[PDB]
Amino acid sequence: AVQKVVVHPLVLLSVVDHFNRIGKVGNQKRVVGVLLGSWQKKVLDVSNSFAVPFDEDDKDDSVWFLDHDYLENMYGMFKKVNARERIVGWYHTGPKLHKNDIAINELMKRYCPNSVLVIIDVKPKDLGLPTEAYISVEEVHDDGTPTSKTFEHVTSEIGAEEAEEVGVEHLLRDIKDTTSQRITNQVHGLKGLNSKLLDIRSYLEKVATGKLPINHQIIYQLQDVFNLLPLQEFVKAFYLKTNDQMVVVYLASLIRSVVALHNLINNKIANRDAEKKEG
Amino acid sequence: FLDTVSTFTSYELMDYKTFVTYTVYVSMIALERPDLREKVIKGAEILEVLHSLPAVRQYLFSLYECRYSVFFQSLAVVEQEMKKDWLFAPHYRYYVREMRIHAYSQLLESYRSLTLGYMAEAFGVGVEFIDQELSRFIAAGRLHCKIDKVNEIVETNRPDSKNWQYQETIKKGDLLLNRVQKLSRVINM
Amino acid sequence: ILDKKFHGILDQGEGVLIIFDEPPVDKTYEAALETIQNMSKVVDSLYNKAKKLT
Amino acid sequence: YLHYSLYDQAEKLVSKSVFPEQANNNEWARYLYYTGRIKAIQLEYSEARRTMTNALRKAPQHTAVGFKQTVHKLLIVVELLLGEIPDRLQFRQPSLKRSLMPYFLLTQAVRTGNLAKFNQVLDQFGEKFQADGTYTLIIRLRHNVIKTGVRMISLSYSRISLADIAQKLQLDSPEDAEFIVAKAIRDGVIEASINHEKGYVQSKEMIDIYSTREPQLAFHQRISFCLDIHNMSVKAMRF
Amino acid sequence: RPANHRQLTFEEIAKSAKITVNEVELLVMKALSVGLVKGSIDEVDKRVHMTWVQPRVLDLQQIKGMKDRLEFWCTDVKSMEMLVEHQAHDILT
Amino acid sequence: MSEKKQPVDEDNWDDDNVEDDFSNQLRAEKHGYKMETS
Amino acid sequence: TIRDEIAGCIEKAYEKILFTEATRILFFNTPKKMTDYAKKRGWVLGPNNYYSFASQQQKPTIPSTELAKQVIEYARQLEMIV
């Protein structure tokens, strides 16, 4: 159970350079390596990790190579450097998954009692946030079959544990403190919209060719949180918002008339000064 | 005249009782109910002397409990008095009807589902009296309230923080806005 | 009621009193009075203007 | 076209090209005054009184002795024709007093509802009314007296009777009071209807009309006007 | 009924729920104990008010024909996003 | 300026506007005589 | 211009009239012309009775989103200027 970890972009850059590695050394495609971390709480830090030299056979994804001299042995040399960021999990590239992820994470489960695998992004093209984490889960079914371990979306976010932007900031050379709202608006809208499009296409598949998860466990309660407001007749909220906009336009009117007077007085003062007292 | 500790008796004070007269003929208007009790009631310094003129004093006493019958009795009284008193001849017209409207203000402010007839008793026989009176008073643009003849209404209304406390905003930020506008027009044309 | 000891409306046409008071509006009072003072200040500045003009 | 007969104001109605930089800053003021007298004599209350108001507040100074005064006597004739005017005395030059000896009693006849005085001010001062030379005032000033009555009393009482106001203003019959109330609904001041059996008005005032979204309708014009003057001060800061 | 009038009268309740007027109150206070619906039921009009509920199990025909809400949402909040942005278009800046 | 055709042409003074507004209401006994009318 | 101004001003904001107020304000006690009024303006000839309609005003609910578009061009005009 983890709500967030420190996704420190330094380990991001490590991932990126070793993806460059797996791309330049040959044709090993799926970047997979070991995630290291220090369990402080349900919250955690991911700033140090590494890729393990591993290969996945085309068929039988349950093919992997985790050298003890490149992990267990390295761990001891890394133990003298910093014992905090312990063996905590691992990661894989490739958008959806392969078949081995579960077996890999359960092999490494001995190292970390809550071991993680992370679908890592090698091409930042997302609408929102990159790679996310998935811890060991026991979530089989109402059927309750032999416990499946397909690691659920163990939410987290991009933790910047420390600034260290002495160089990081020194890299951006692009942005300011955006005093931007429109950017947020277009992003939010289009993202909700394309998400809903993915939704409707998925559900048309469900009706057409979708499996038993057609309404698996929450998709109906998905529609229930949609059913939060199931024209929604917000007439209570309509006159509510009427008084709200009384407040809004009182704000607008008073404040912006103040703004008017404000610039008016002294801008005109300086204007007339430099205008007629110049000649 | 808030001194009351420095105008005991002087070659300028024609009569300290007349000092009290001039004082009350401005304090039953300046002094709102808090200031009323502050200066008249609380300020018992003038009381040790205004003990000599109890007519308007008891008028002021009713001026707290709002006893409109004796209000009108002493109202007629003080009306004649000002009618026969210096430096008021061409102006005393308002003071009395002002006392009228001001008292009616609070009286209606009591509550709404009320009648002038229930107060016509306090008005004396004041149905037609206050009919024309308050007709011309609201016509004088006074005392936002509601009253009828076939219904005989009373009202408590006129909250400033309904629109006026927000209307002054433009009332002035347009008056002065265009003031400075034309003022800042001839700066160039 | 006249002295803020009570805040509400009584009745004789219905004989039913009702209590109410919700005065405080820091927005209106505060901002409006500040703007009034701003108007006074602009009135002040008007004479600096009329002077530096002529 | 003002001093002589009045035929070619349709020329301004078809060829309204009257908008320069408004350079001389008093030429435009008195220009709006003259065309306010035009719309006053065509027919207008609202637009004419607002351009009279704009020329009034666009009086340049008082550095020229008593020249606002006669022209202001003819300026607020339309405000007299409103009926909602008090005595106008804050304008009064004391050298204008001997010429407004008619005009002071005329605005007193605006404040009074007397009929014999409404025609006795005319019978007393028709020559100065010809010095004005505007019949438009007296052709509607009786109607202004009855509209002053209807505004006052219809703002006063919720369910008045037409007989009370009628035989309070000497109407003597129900049916012309009905035509008064009907042409007042047609002129749109108050809701007041008739409990139709023999008249006997059943009516109401109007509070709880609206007070929140309706100000912020006009606040668009408030602050859009403010930002117009912002950009005008910007284009004036350019100088 | 997806529609409003969520201040429903007690009438359909007392007709089709085989319950009486004196027992609709128990019918929904026992449901407050249940906890799937928590209405703010009117009692001056006796109306059984509808708040949030626990909806269904499966409506596969409405899992297919939820497009009139889902694609409704998608293209209409998208279009009105385009309209807000299209009225504030050239302050892209 | 007056460059137009127009070149052709508090004791109680403060209370005077109200006075002419008071010029229509019982200017200054029938108020008090109404007491004994009923 | 008496009669078509009666067609306007017969119930502008009235409660109701009857046969006798038609006989007073109108004239010519009953032709097919006041019957033509009752069958020409969209009128309910009530039982010796008159009404403009069943509600007289055609019953006069969103003041929000149009002023939201106003806020769009309003903030837009406050933009591009300083």
Swiss-Prot record, chain A:
Gene3D superfamilies in UniProt: Cytidine Deaminase, domain 2
Keyword Transmembrane in annotation: no
Keywords, in A-Z order: Acetylation, Isopeptide bond, Proteasome, Ubl conjugation
UniProt cross-link Glycyl lysine isopeptide (Lys-Gly) (interchain with G-Cter in ubiquitin), position: 176
Single Gene Ontology BP annotation: proteasome-mediated ubiquitin-dependent protein catabolic process
Disulfide bridges in this chain: none
Domain MPN as annotated: residue spans: 5-140
Sites of N6-acetyllysine modification: 196, 206
GO CC terms in record: cytosol; extracellular exosome; extracellular region; ficolin-1-rich granule lumen; membrane; nucleoplasm; nucleus; proteasome complex
GO molecular function, one term: protein homodimerization activity
Functional summary from the UniProt entry: Component of the 26S proteasome, a multiprotein complex involved in the ATP-dependent degradation of ubiquitinated proteins. This complex plays a key role in the maintenance of protein homeostasis by removing misfolded or damaged proteins, which could impair cellular functions, and by removing proteins whose functions are no longer required. Therefore, the proteasome participates in numerous cellular processes, including cell cycle progression, apoptosis, or DNA damage repair.
Family affiliation: Belongs to the peptidase M67A family.
Additional information: Does not bind a metal ion.
Descriptive protein name: 26S proteasome non-ATPase regulatory subunit 7
UniProtKB/Swiss-Prot annotation, chain C:
Induction behaviour: By FOXO4; expression in embryonic stem cells (ESCs) is mediated by FOXO4.
Summary of the tissues where the protein is detected: Highly expressed in embryonic stem cells (ESCs). Expression decreases as ESCs differentiate.
Post-translational modification: Phosphorylated by AMPK.
Signal sequence, start to end: none
Compartments, record wording: Nucleus; Cytoplasm, Cytosol
Function, in words: Component of the 26S proteasome, a multiprotein complex involved in the ATP-dependent degradation of ubiquitinated proteins. This complex plays a key role in the maintenance of protein homeostasis by removing misfolded or damaged proteins, which could impair cellular functions, and by removing proteins whose functions are no longer required. Therefore, the proteasome participates in numerous cellular processes, including cell cycle progression, apoptosis, or DNA damage repair. In the complex, PSMD11 is required for proteasome assembly.
Subunit structure: Component of the 19S proteasome regulatory particle complex. The 26S proteasome consists of a 20S core particle (CP) and two 19S regulatory subunits (RP). The regulatory particle is made of a lid composed of 9 subunits including PSMD11, a base containing 6 ATPases and few additional components.
Record-stated family: Belongs to the proteasome subunit S9 family.
Protein name: 26S proteasome non-ATPase regulatory subunit 11
Native species: Homo sapiens (Human)
Gene: PSMD11
Section covered of the full-length record: 369 to 422 of 422
Swiss-Prot record, chain E:
Modified residues (N6-acetyllysine): 15
Source taxon at top rank: Eukaryota
Disulfide-bond pairs as recorded: none
Family affiliation: Belongs to the proteasome subunit S11 family.
Known partners and oligomeric status: Component of the 19S proteasome regulatory particle complex. The 26S proteasome consists of a 20S core particle (CP) and two 19S regulatory subunits (RP). The regulatory particle is made of a lid composed of 9 subunits including PSMD13, a base containing 6 ATPases and few additional components.
Entry function: Component of the 26S proteasome, a multiprotein complex involved in the ATP-dependent degradation of ubiquitinated proteins. This complex plays a key role in the maintenance of protein homeostasis by removing misfolded or damaged proteins, which could impair cellular functions, and by removing proteins whose functions are no longer required. Therefore, the proteasome participates in numerous cellular processes, including cell cycle progression, apoptosis, or DNA damage repair.
Protein name: 26S proteasome non-ATPase regulatory subunit 13
Gene field: PSMD13
Covered range of the whole protein: 284 to 376 of 376
From Swiss-Prot, chain G:
Subunit structure, interactors included: Component of the 19S proteasome regulatory particle complex. The 26S proteasome consists of a 20S core particle (CP) and two 19S regulatory subunits (RP). The regulatory particle is made of a lid composed of 9 subunits including PSMD8, a base containing 6 ATPases and few additional components. Interacts with DDI2. Interacts with TASOR.
Record-stated family: Belongs to the proteasome subunit S14 family.
Upper taxonomic lineage: Eukaryota, Metazoa, Chordata, Craniata, Vertebrata
Organism: Homo sapiens
Function: Component of the 26S proteasome, a multiprotein complex involved in the ATP-dependent degradation of ubiquitinated proteins. This complex plays a key role in the maintenance of protein homeostasis by removing misfolded or damaged proteins, which could impair cellular functions, and by removing proteins whose functions are no longer required. Therefore, the proteasome participates in numerous cellular processes, including cell cycle progression, apoptosis, or DNA damage repair.
Superkingdom of the source species: Eukaryota
Record's protein name: 26S proteasome non-ATPase regulatory subunit 8
Covalent cross-link (Glycyl lysine isopeptide (Lys-Gly) (interchain with G-Cter in SUMO2)), residues: 32
Signal sequence residues: none
